[PDB]
Amino acid sequence: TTKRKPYVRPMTSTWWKKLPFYRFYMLREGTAVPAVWFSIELIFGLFALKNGPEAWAGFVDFLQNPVIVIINLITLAAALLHTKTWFELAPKAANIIVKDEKMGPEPIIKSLWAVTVVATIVILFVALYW
Amino acid sequence: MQTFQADLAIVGAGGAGLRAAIAAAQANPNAKIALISKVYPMRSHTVAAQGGSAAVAQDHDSFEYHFHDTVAGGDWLCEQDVVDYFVHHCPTEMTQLELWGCPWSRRPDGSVNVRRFGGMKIERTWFAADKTGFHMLHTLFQTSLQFPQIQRFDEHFVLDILVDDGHVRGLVAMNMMEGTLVQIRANAVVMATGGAGRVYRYNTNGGIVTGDGMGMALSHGVPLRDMEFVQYHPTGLPGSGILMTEGCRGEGGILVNKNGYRYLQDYGMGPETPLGEPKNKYMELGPRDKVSQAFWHEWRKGNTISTPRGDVVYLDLRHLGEKKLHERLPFICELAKAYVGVDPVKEPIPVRPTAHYTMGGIETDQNCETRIKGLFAVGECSSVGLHGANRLGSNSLAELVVFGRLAGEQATERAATAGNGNEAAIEAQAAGVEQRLKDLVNQDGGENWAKIRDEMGLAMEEGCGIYRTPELMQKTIDKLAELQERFKRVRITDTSSVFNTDLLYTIELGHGLNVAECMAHSAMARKESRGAHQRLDEGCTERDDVNFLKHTLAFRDADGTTRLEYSDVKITTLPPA
Amino acid sequence: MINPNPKRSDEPVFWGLFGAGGMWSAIIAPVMILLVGILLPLGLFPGDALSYERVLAFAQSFIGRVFLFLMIVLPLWCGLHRMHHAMHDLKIHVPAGKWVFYGLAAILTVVTLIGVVTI
Amino acid sequence: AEMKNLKIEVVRYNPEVDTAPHSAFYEVPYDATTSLLDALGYIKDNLAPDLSYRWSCRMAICGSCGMMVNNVPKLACKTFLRDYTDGMKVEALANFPIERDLVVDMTHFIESLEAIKPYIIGNSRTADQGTNIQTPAQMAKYHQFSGCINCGLCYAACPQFGLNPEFIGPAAITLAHRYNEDSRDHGKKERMAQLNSQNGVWSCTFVGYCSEVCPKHVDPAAAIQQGKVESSKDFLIATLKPR
Ligand code: SF4
Ligand code: F3S
């Protein structure tokens, strides 16, 4: 026989709960739940703004509801988190070389952000000003 | 005893025996090669090398230049025909490594760069960053994978080789994990177990370096030669003895006393140099033992700086300012701040000289064959005689690769002629490998091996180090003699059968306990001084080629003694000068 | 041991989508939450630039038609892919998951593509 | 002076004897230079000859002494008692199966390290010919991915592996990527088939914890993404492939 007894550990569901880096990992990922629900709100929006103005006003009513409004800010928070985190990872799949060294993330992260900054406005000027 | 047949059997898998596998593996495609080692091949010491492998490569260089460098370097104690051959194969063999795709560092044109090392004029050191030995070993270890002809026996500590009627017939080993012994039968064995330095208190050698191979060799009447030249590295972190590479000195390092006076300007190493101009052969890139000697000289002067780590000098680098470093000097930095708390810009890294390489080894002829037909040794565990009395920086990895393929071949070949030995005797000899090991396990007696280990190592360090004196070597023999007796009285706690390192450790301590005895008499007998062995007793303080131009041969005998024999040094175009 | 020949997963599809997904839901989604989620019903928007009348204009007009598709869709794929996995990452056995989610992820791409083509 | 005392908890586990790992407490003398390896030594040396564990180089280069310290993967090699005054629990490197004490069976690791053919494929040239040429530039492409010391710590940080043991793991893909990205290689086909499988790169949710613990700053996770971008380019060409 062998005189060995290779002991194998349990890998629970509480796994992610242990390290504060896994906790945060799971988070970035929950970031999707709200990100979908908002896609559902948008849809309702699309179908109400079609059932005719009577309805689209009741859509907006639902958007007036306090509850819906905590929930919706929280949606914004997710999003903002996703946007932050996501930008720091994409870079890590581009393997570019400048001068004669292999470049880092510091720079793309910067533009991915500029582009957000600009769109954010060029879009808010469109829906709000013109 | 579970047995296995095999065309050839390679003990050890760092540099050399790794390259030996590869070689044999292609000299003959249908061969069944067994690569044994006590650790996965990749953690072999050869990883920790930094400087590089020597290999004649510049256009203004020349094999005569590299040949003559090597002889004088070692002080004529090298066997010239072996050296000749060595020089002429290093460039093929480094290329081939670059062919298997080892990452040598390069020149803007896509060709191979060289570095200054080991005190030669015309540079020839090939290097993969500051991490050369890791790139080599890792590069050989993956390359070998593409050959099923090599079946690795990993984590298998090797106990004894098999011998009969002048010939090798196999080996015995323990599967570490399983706790059992197979016996591998082959008719050639390349011994490439690597280094003997851990038998010292302070040194750079990893844990595995304990003399295994050289031991087994002694027990079969085979001698260890040039066993008393032990080589010491100038810059060792205190305590660990971790290597600080010559590289940093070569990039602008300083070495200074409590007054930070740059002190190697008066041990015949001076004309000082500008911070910027570091110059070959002078002050801080001055001559090897010289620098080490000045430590002792400046130690004996009350001039070294006392730490709990031990006395020290300081090498200064703080005066290079980043960019200089991180391009060419990164690990050293991480090393500093880790192992001693010193960030290479705001304070100075304490370094004392420390024990490093085994110029000595198992006697071999020019093909790596021992006096026992079918048994070869290659690598630092061996004594082909390239190094004579003092290794030259960068020549050592060069060796592995260069003579490990010739060992690879010759082995192969020998293995294709052996004819069969007496299949009865041999079995009965592996038979005794078991009985013997067992008489160790039950030992009742109670010595912590551990004290023996600290005690030997220290003994070694005090009476067989840089500056040597009779009275003291004599101590070291007497110590060892004693340790030796006492080992027969140490009982081994773990009777457990799975990865029981309590035992393996002991077995290895016993071996160095024999290499040791075997370097102290070698030394106390060498009444002269050469390359790395320097006595002060009156009369033997100069190099003597009248009566000291020979290799020392030490032989453990069966009755337990260490006995000497002197064979001559082979000359060809460079007579003692 | 390590199966000589392995089956080429098909994941570089959901992943590929998901890429587009995440990047869009990352430049453009925070701003729109702001509008539709807060600004719109908190009345904090100048004159009548966000009222049935105006919104419908945009919605109804092509580049605002292409627009709401992508703004609905990608964020769907992206997040659905993530909760797929996010399921396993939590050791939860979902019967036929691949079809459920990317299933649902299609149905809803359809519903939307509908709304958008009708008006 | 007079030297401090830390109280270490090391997890012992014997097959021959115990039925499950279990704790144990050792008291170790120490100063500002004392490493985990160092203590591990002091222990076996004078209060527990029976402890066995892996180590060699002593300077965080060889890659044997990895383990867990307070749930974090590390090299005994390079862990100092000074950073653990409020307490220290040492288990066997997670996500691998304990064989004995602080040594764990690492065969999956190797088997994988092997599987992806980590050697130059199809490059004809031979020595007499000279080295190939490769510019400080080309080198750069795969350079960092070559500093892996087969230590196994990334494998003990990636849950995706501890949820799915058939996954070839960070290092493995990295190593592969390195040969893949090396200008002088010609065995990319030879290597993709693994990579493109489910226990290939697509078993990665990009947690990133592996790149976070690498003692030789290799950033395995940058390697795997690149993998993905390449797997994916491969899947497309093969969708235009059936031929
Ligand atoms: S990638 Fe890093 S952490 Fe992983 S095995 Fe290699 S050296 Fe260790
Ligand atoms: S932590 Fe694991 S999930 Fe991928 S990013 Fe590293 S292999």
Ligand code: FES
């Ligand atoms: S003992 Fe070598 S990695 Fe620490």
